[PDB]
């Protein structure tokens, strides 16, 4: 319609405001995706030895066998449209691989530090001592944990195992 564009400019300038609004929405979405994940500067890694006092974390740590580098839980959550007349979809800035790397680094830093990596330098501490210090924040002493560490680890492993089954069962 080579003649339709002539009277289009007679109604004023409306393409500038809508394009500006779409650009602002895209920048806002990028900022929202960033301000949630990109919060730490150092990328922490997990040690080769995976004996954390007796607690199993094989369902949350990334699996190095598959090329996706995602954990067992992230696979179940992940495994669960063309240009019609000009409507185009812009790809995000941060990719799924980068998001997974950020989450793995955060989890590794957490497991290694406790509550000091988010406030200053990284300080190493055993997981048993970390749990003994966390138990004091609610009133329970450390002897209860030093006695029932086995039962607590068994209950934690059972809960971690049942979480995946519940997520696979619930489809809503």
């Amino acid at each position: 319609s080579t003649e339709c564009s002539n009277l289009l400019l007679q109604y004023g300038s409306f393409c500038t405001q809508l394009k500006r609004a779409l650009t602002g929405i895209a920048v806002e979405q990028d900022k929202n995706t960033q301000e949630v994940f990109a919060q730490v500067k150092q990328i922490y890694k997990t040690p080769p030895i995976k004996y954390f006092g007796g607690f199993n974390f094989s369902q949350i740590l990334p699996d190095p066998s598959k090329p996706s580098k995602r954990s067992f839980i992230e696979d179940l959550l992940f495994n669960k449209a063309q240009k019609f007349k000009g409507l185009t979809v812009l790809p995000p800035l941060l990719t799924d691989e980068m998001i997974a790397q950020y989450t793995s680094a955060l989890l590794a830093g957490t497991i290694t530090s406790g509550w000091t990596f988010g406030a200053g330098a990284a300080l190493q501490i055993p997981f048993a001592m970390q749990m003994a210090y966390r138990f004091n924040g609610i009133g329970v002493t450390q002897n209860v944990l030093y006695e029932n560490q086995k039962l607590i680890a068994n209950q934690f492993n059972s809960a971690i195992g049942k979480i995946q089954d519940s997520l696979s069962s619930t489809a809503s």
Partner: protein, 50 residues
Amino acid sequence: GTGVLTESNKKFLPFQQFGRDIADTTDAVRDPQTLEILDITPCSFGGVSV
């Protein structure tokens, strides 16, 4: 209309001539004097950023 003419592997019944898509748009046609399944595709376009 306008677009690029290609060949699709479609099996139309021998009474239909037009062709529609999910979004109510023409996507497939029929050769009038040859009876061959032709496929149309939109012309190339896009946006430019600096």
